[model samples]
Target: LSVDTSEYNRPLIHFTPEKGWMNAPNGLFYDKTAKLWHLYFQYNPNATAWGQPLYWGHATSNDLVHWDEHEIAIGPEHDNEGIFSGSIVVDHNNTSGFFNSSIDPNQRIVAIYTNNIPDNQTQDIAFSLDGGYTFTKYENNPVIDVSSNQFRDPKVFWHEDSNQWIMVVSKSQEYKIQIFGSANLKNWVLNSNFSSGYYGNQYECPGLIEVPIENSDKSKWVMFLAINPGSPLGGSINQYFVGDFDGFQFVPDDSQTRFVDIGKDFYAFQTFSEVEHGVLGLAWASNWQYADQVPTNPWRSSTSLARNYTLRYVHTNAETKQLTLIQNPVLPDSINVVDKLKKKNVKLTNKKPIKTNFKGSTGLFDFNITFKVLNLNVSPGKTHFDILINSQELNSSVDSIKIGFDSSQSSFYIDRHIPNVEFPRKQFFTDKLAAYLEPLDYDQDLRVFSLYGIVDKNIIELYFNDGTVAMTNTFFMGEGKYPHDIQIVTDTEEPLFELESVIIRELNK
Candidate 1:
């Protein structure tokens, strides 16, 4: 049964009207003068072929939907340079030694983008005038450039207090966004680093800004970044660091570094524009590292719509002080689906995991379950909790959240495998792709890893370890309520889990 989104009832925003490959929000700006939203992103015209035109895709909308797509904002035509990933802003001052490309002296939109140099490396820069709708290739192009093939994805913000501008850029392993500062949005110098090894390989999509908690006056500055290797807790999840930024450095409370959405489908999220909604983020919903080869509909990839994010910390287990990420949909209020649910509450000892039977769903389906993570019979308990979609397909489960070594010695099978474009001759598509990836260096130790899963036709996305690792899979199970195994068995740690809510929004008509 292919899970259905039709009964989803909520009007799905007609997104990405421009078809083909779209990844990462390149740059976002809310033009105060024009009273319009301008968004830039990475565009690969031929997704099926996966070549590198790497132009900056452009679109504008008063609302996030109903976009007006424009021709390539920046292209690979100039000296083999691909207008890579970065951000855009209103260059209030025609500084950076360039003029605004679009508007007049005071009313101009400034475009600050990632200028990709040779060797697949990157440098950040600001184009003069009218927001790089056209650019002068300023003398100070590489505002902040490092030597790694890795340095890319820059995000810029204005700091009124310090009377300066702040910027963030990516480097290889162990980071999300690194800080930088400038008297103006041009000429940036380096700043301090935070939670260095939190991600896998070269980082992309770095962001830093303030987001207000509902009803709170003071806001928390959040530094966000997405990496390919995934998080230490397991699957590829969008993670963030919330702390204070003092112009020169970021002070992220070590524990404050957490996953944004523990669900399988969330990654590389960026704002439609800063301070547009109360607190909002839009993310690339699917991973392309291996997806270019998957089946493509007329509409290739879809993104999770602008979600109003509420940042909070959740303690999963009482004894082991591990806090997971908690995300709530900002716009789910409009989704008029079957909100009632048939949920159960069960209690079991650490050594005992229970099994429950639930019906299966096909076509457009939406289900939500928030449960406590109990002890699993296995060590590192990532392989605990399995949900059998039907008789044969045991859909949702986690392997382990361990990475590298020491107290927790061994990277997860998921992190160890980040499907890189290593060899040109090698190919990577087949049914075998679904084969259960086994943890090679297993240090079987039962650790309390909690998970939640929501299934829609063709998508079985799970969030585990309290939203630490989100696993996504697409398979069709026939419609009807099927008995699903919901036991959390482990070798150690007395397990206990609580289901706070289980709401299933079925197909509309």
Candidate 2:
């Protein structure tokens, strides 16, 4: 049998493997000495689908947007074991004793990961003396094994306050996160366990980090949990908790269940370690529901664009307020703008829809739109706005992907059931991905909302209202055709809202 090597639905901007299956990002860290970002992931090099004997694929980049693939970083030493999800850290002080005096302290990179066999899973470690290009497995393996098959995904970090190394790992079947403390990388002891809040059908890929609150001196701990087969939208998605961790235990501020992304395609999101400021993250941009079934050739799956996450307070009403997390895309310093459009105070009516045509030759671009309600007294479902992307005017209707705002549900949604696009999986076309909007301010008349979207070839990353709500979804246009037009429409005859501004920037990589 021969394989098709055509570039059908391949992403132009997002990161994908050269040709294989790739899942959860593993061992992400930035090297201060080399000034490069190192990223590793779950890769099956032999096939386009996931299989046994998984390896840790490696890549490096000066800027997070552009990546250069390297050789396989770590693989299974034994035939019965597969390298699984984990984390990496820079041994700046040589805490692990894996390096000698001949090597600089910053050059020592240590990776802690899971070793999966048939009936058991355990934590293992490896060290690299040369800046993460290759690694040597620890001779005394299974650093922290509980003799449990479901224990896996260890995220390791240095806790300065406790003066020890801390690991937050998942107990998948029990829906629990077990915290372990290690004086050296080789030995570990259990400190605490967290099982509070929402426990879906199964939990995996637990990430713990300290995040700085926007415009404040105080910082809080954020715990990220990857839940499978139980997201609000279905299949696999990421959920997080805003809390405090004191090197041993994690305490949440509330019991509220908050989602990292309300879209169906984002899962196994991992944050980079040893960053200078703020938090940077990447996620597997395909759901487990239909990952292998997507119509791609030679390779499958891509990662979400890098994001900068911050904590802030949001006001839901005049009397109620709470702290939450928000995210923004990490864009390059200079992206050539091919075309731009800025319009203000344009009224929307039911008679005709506003349409804009881009002059760029490709389908990659960025679009930002803001809407202001003219009257708050209008019926909830009366005023609706649907922004269509990659649009084409057909005989009587428009063929496009719909991003809509429904006042009835107080939600922003994405509907990809357009013409000329088909997938084998029913989950891809069954329901629209919707995220409920929180009230922005206390004032009644100053009700304004914003949406920012980065559209690559087949993926769309959307940030609603400065990323109070974020969503990522992928769609494959028919006949390898990508439309380059946008349209805005409403369902009501009355003029209930006005477009405050619309800015479209054509992207040049």
Candidate 3:
């Protein structure tokens, strides 16, 4: 099957399959021998809509920006089976005993995943001999099975302290993470289970990693959990817990709810194994709420831009501080700046709107804006401003995405209710998707607020206050419509806030 690359709605910077449907990313790891980043995902090669008997689609890249598609890595042996989400690990010490004298230890790759049958889901394993390009399923499959369909999505890693391989798998129906340990890749023993934190309708895609905290010698364990039909904004969102894991169980630092991304999109977030620096992650950019019904042809969904994750201590209020997860997009050096714009100290009013038209292509661009809060005490919803994209006029009827900040709620929001264009699914179009911003210091009479945003065709990623808060959202501007103009507007009659600086850069892939 041939895929047309000229589709207007397709993302230019994000990763999308050439054809067919794709959901969660699976088996993400770096191959040291090949010096390549290997990514595997849940795929249905036959159609644009998701179905049973899914396969693990393969792709490799030196830099996360560009990818080379490979053959199917793992697939169902029978018609009733489906290969679901899982993880991969490099058997450097030959712990799995799947290697021989002829095969180097660095080339040994083991994949642990869920094999989904009609009403039964079991954990299975496969081995790769040629640097993860090919795989062979173990003769003794279902490494750990309890005859329960909810047991799936096992993420395995070598636990140095315990001197064993630790697997964190999801017990979907129970909303728990089942922890198991294995000396070899075959036999597994249940160590413990974690069932705290936010429980949506169901729990899927569980991951545990030790991440380094910024500006400190300490590191903390962060567990990733994804749920559907329970996000306050909408369906299919990822939430995390920062805690301590000692090979047996995970204990969170707090029970407060924390979201990975505060948008209608973004789900099934998975991190890569054997990364040299901070934790590298990629997530499914389309929500399960409308994944199958997206308007794109020949392809269904796209993966989020590769993000580098780190832990940082941020001030939530004037007196309190919290350790937060920070995400920064990993961009290749090959991306060139085509155009640039800079402005400072721009005043705004209800009747005046600041408009910017790019000289180069607007399909891919980045903008950084800083706002100066003049009054510390302002009414809720009164001190807010919006930045509009992909439209010619400042009209609500035009096809555009409205992103702004409302001081009343102390949150940043994205509005994708385009009046002219209708989406295939009603849930895909939402009134507002908001992410809470760190509260401003009330002691200061005047303070600065910063925002950084990236626009790539159908996707918009926003970072507030130097990656303190992030939101990833997807929007379609209809066929033949592209981004070329941006407008900034405010609703307040008085100048409650002043635009300090604006820097825009157009990017070329």
Candidate 4:
């Protein structure tokens, strides 16, 4: 398997455990104390069934590679309530929020989580002052308990503008699971109600980040939501949604809400808003409906690296519908690959093994790749072509593109926007770039079409047909990243397909 990862603005590496269960980011927090990445994610070690008792898994790294998956961070049958997803914050001033002084060392890095107690769904608070080595749950427990069994994900953030703290917990009411706010990190006061705007009963992971308006004409708030049991609600999927937002709530704005990813395989997406350069995030790239059914790859499942997610100006007529979510890989060490890939001819195939033999590479953002669309009918028709993006660059389990058949259509797709990861602000709709890929006319049989995507330590920039169409995607690299091999596949085969030529470039940061 030798395709090019150097084209995607990132360093490449083979990343993927032999196999197991992993999805959506649990506690994605930037430890200001250790100056490293500390995370608490839902891990179903018993293979790939995350229905209940989802253990809180831990992993950390300075370079976003070379991970150390610690034991179940918060696991217990009684008080251990099924640890769901939430946000982690650094008290900065030894203020764990809760009114307790005999606090354990873990309180320095406060963790706000929702515990699925046997009786009801409640929000709990924990701390990890000793750099996440240990955690101390709040004695008061059930910091915030509201609504019926319709409570789960809890998102916490400090609002400097409003001079208060805001917490958004997913609650199932009449239509959708609405989120509320708070003055103190504890009691969540009602802010507003978000009726069932998207699909599904209750919301899963939610993210709200603040971004500057692209044209700066309208508002500057964005709200994102991620739901389970997602079906075909809009043009793309049922996993994610992006739309305009006010500090209080979100509205698809126009009755016509759009999808983020066009591919049918992205879900439980979490947003990230912490980067010296920009905002990034990572998501489990498996459809809930087809998770158990989809044929597992040599490596079971893959989680997308924290990529750059921004509000892009959609290329449409109605100003409101003229926006989309644009994402890219967030590589921390991408400057290492600019002058390294060994410009050469590479081949493609799905069955072949991907390479993981990397030399002096960690803390990703140092890889590149090239995929040329062609007319070689490797199959029977125009196929959906993409590259196997390694994880080392941005700690991304899979970094690749879903090549399109023509210029009019885009391979991008995603579910309704859900606030998954905690950001300084909120998430909004974004769209950028214009693609005018003129597929080789039947008169001319171009051997292959090409794509150059670069994964930096913080962003993924892709250029189709040598910059004819370019899109910038961003992602986050948790603790560490692993090495990876490149590959090509054809599910929706095109008439003329086959890699006539390909290449890779890498940087050793």
TM-score, one value per model: 0.63, 0.93, 0.93, 0.64
Q: Rank the candidates by TM-score, best first.
A: 2, 3, 4, 1
lDDT of each: 0.51, 0.82, 0.83, 0.50
Give the per-residue lDDT digits (tens) of candidate 1, residues 44-146: 7755333476777777766654467777777664546677776766556554435534455444545566666567565555453553355455466565657
Worst 10 residues of 4 by lDDT: 412-421
Q: What is the lDDT of residue 337 in candidate 3?
A: 81
In model 4, the number of clashes is 125
Name the runs in model 1 displaced over 4 angstroms: 1-14, 32-36, 65-68, 92-107, 124-140, 173-177, 195-197, 230-236, 255-257, 319-326, 332-509
Off by over 4 Å in 3: 1-6, 348-354, 376-382, 391-398, 439-444, 491-495
RMSD in angstroms, all models?
A: 9.4, 2.5, 2.7, 11.0
* Candidate 3: tens digits of C-alpha lDDT, residues 223-256: 9999887776678889899989998888999887
Which candidate would rank higher by TM-score, 1 or 4?
4
lDDT of 2 by residue, 1-509 (tens): 15543343667668888888998899999898899888899999888788878999998888887889999999996766689999998887787888988776767899999999989899999999778988999999989889999999999999999989999999988999999999898999999988865677888999999989999899999999998877767788899999899899999988898889888788999999889899999999988888887767678888998899999887655576678889999888756777777788888877867776665445677888887766645665665788887643445454568888866565688887766555677544444777777645324655677889888767889998888878998776654455577777887777666777888776756
Clashes of 3: 0
Q: After superposition, how far is residue 338 of candidate 2 from its true place, in Å?
A: 2.2
lDDT accuracy of residue 159 in candidate 1? 78
